[PDB]
Amino acid sequence: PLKVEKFATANRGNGLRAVTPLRPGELLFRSDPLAYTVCKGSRGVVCDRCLLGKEKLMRCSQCRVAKYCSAKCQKKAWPDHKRECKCLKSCKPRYPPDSVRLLGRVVFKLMDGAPSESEKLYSFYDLESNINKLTEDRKEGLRQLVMTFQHFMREEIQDASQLPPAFDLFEAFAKVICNSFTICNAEMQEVGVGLYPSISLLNHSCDPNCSIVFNGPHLLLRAVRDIEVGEELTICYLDMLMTSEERRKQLRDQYCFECDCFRCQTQDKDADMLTGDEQVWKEVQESLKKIEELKAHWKWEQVLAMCQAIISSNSERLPDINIYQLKVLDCAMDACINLGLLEEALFYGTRTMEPYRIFFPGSHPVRGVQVMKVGKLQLHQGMFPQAMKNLRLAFDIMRVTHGREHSLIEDLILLLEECDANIRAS
Ligand SMILES: C[S@@+](CC[C@H](N)C(=O)[O-])C[C@H]1O[C@@H](n2cnc3c(N)ncnc32)[C@H](O)[C@@H]1O
Ligand SMILES: Cn1cnc(S(N)(=O)=O)c1
Ligand SMILES: Cn1cnc(S(N)(=O)=O)c1
Ligand SMILES: [Zn+2]
Ligand SMILES: [Zn+2]
Ligand SMILES: [Zn+2]
């Protein structure tokens, strides 16, 4: 039976609340997307269908835009790719924004597909659009997306009879803005974007009681605190490494609301997050625009070069608890891992451990994965007691945030068994 239910909140629209008492780690809901696509930077790097990486991908012969890890993935993707294929080819040199490709797949799914389990609690039709809070500047952007959609889809959609009844493209893009989910791979790299309308019932908190995690395109929703009957379920929409000012801007611009939580009222952790010399971390924050762009396109050697110029700068440096320094350390660690520079990766990774303990309180999947990566690096460098401690810590977090239904837990159990065997052998 469902442990969760839709309800009408007092001042944040519809929400989701507990039907039964919930414990940390409890699986509350799981969902495939209504529609999803690979994101800009990962196109051609990960499989369109399973969103896993591969050194060589197979391309769709007709459009040569969709790329796949296997014949299986290519063929199972064909029903949901068939109609967009004509459009991606027709516009051969042009590639549409991710949101436009996403909405194309929404339309095809709603027109040609059976009703999706993803809409069990809440449908695309039901989604919040915030249209009466949009600024004129945002409306202008949405009008351009509508015209972009109309151009991209012209081979397949010519009139309203090819859209769902009373479907309004402007309203649909407004819904996409404030209900899109960023799909992350097992290493927490962003790889795609999707709509999960039942999961869109969850309202935001800067200190939430639930968490979502992705296993390929599949989404698991779990409790990460004790929750009482009738209590609202919340997730954090945002990266934890953000000041209250940064959160204010994104929640206004993307979600059209003002956050009243205790953390925003008190600027909780802002001061620690911005320690060090302001001129230095303003330069690092600016450099992170390019670093994060490079990372999104998997350009690890270039990422590492930029990060080393900051971490080992001849000029003034920042404390590791400064969030921009911390982001650079994380990017450098992931770059070193993907480049096989495991000694250097462990150095950066170990430095992030205490800041992550502070900025990801309780059970958060980003910290669980980070601790796992550090433990794995220590295990393969022969540091068995230290690896075991971190792998056990990762398990303590990821049993709650990931659970047995997530394949990464199985990978972690293997590392724990390996590390334990090494300790028993003395
Ligand atoms: C993904 S939807 C969540 C469900 C939404 N309340 C609904 O009725 O469909 C996101 C929208 O919910 C609203 N909202 C979400 N979290 C909120 C919060 N803490 N405080 C106030 N409004 C919130 C905002 O309108 C936001 O744009
Ligand atoms: C109840 N309600 C739903 N949506 C709103 S809105 N569009 O954010 O003003 C209010
Ligand atoms: C509907 N929604 C938008 N973003 C999210 S989140 N928490 O960032 O996955 C949920
Ligand atoms: Zn695949
Ligand atoms: Zn194709
Ligand atoms: Zn808040």
UniProtKB/Swiss-Prot annotation:
Keywords: Acetylation, Chromatin regulator, Cytoplasm, Metal-binding, Methyltransferase, Nucleus, Phosphoprotein, S-adenosyl-L-methionine, Transferase, Zinc, Zinc-finger. It catalyses: L-lysyl(4)-[histone H3] + 3 S-adenosyl-L-methionine = N(6),N(6),N(6)-trimethyl-L-lysyl(4)-[histone H3] + 3 S-adenosyl-L-homocysteine + 3 H(+). One of its GO terms (cellular component) is nucleoplasm. Histone methyltransferase activity strongly stimulated by HSPCA. S-adenosyl-L-methionine binds at R12, G13, N14, Y122, N130, N179, N203, H204, Y237, F257. It is found in: Cytoplasm; Nucleus. Pfam families: SET, zf-MYND. A zinc finger (MYND-type) spans 47-85. Its EC number is 2.1.1.354. Residues 270-426 are annotated as: C-terminal domain. Zn(2+) 2 binds at C60, C63, H81, C85. Coiled coil: none annotated. It comes from the Eukaryota. Expressed in skeletal muscles and testis. Overexpressed in a majority of colorectal and hepatocellular carcinomas. PROSITE patterns: SAM_MT43_2, SET, ZF_MYND_1, ZF_MYND_2. The modification Phosphothreonine is found at T20. Zn(2+) 1 binds at C47, C50, C69, C73. Residues 2-238 form the SET domain. Histone methyltransferase. Specifically methylates 'Lys-4' of histone H3, inducing di- and tri-methylation, but not monomethylation. Also methylates 'Lys-5' of histone H4. Plays an important role in transcriptional activation as a member of an RNA polymerase complex. Binds DNA containing 5'-CCCTCC-3' or 5'-GAGGGG-3' sequences. Belongs to the class V-like SAM-binding methyltransferase superfamily. Histone-lysine methyltransferase family. This is Histone-lysine N-methyltransferase SMYD3.
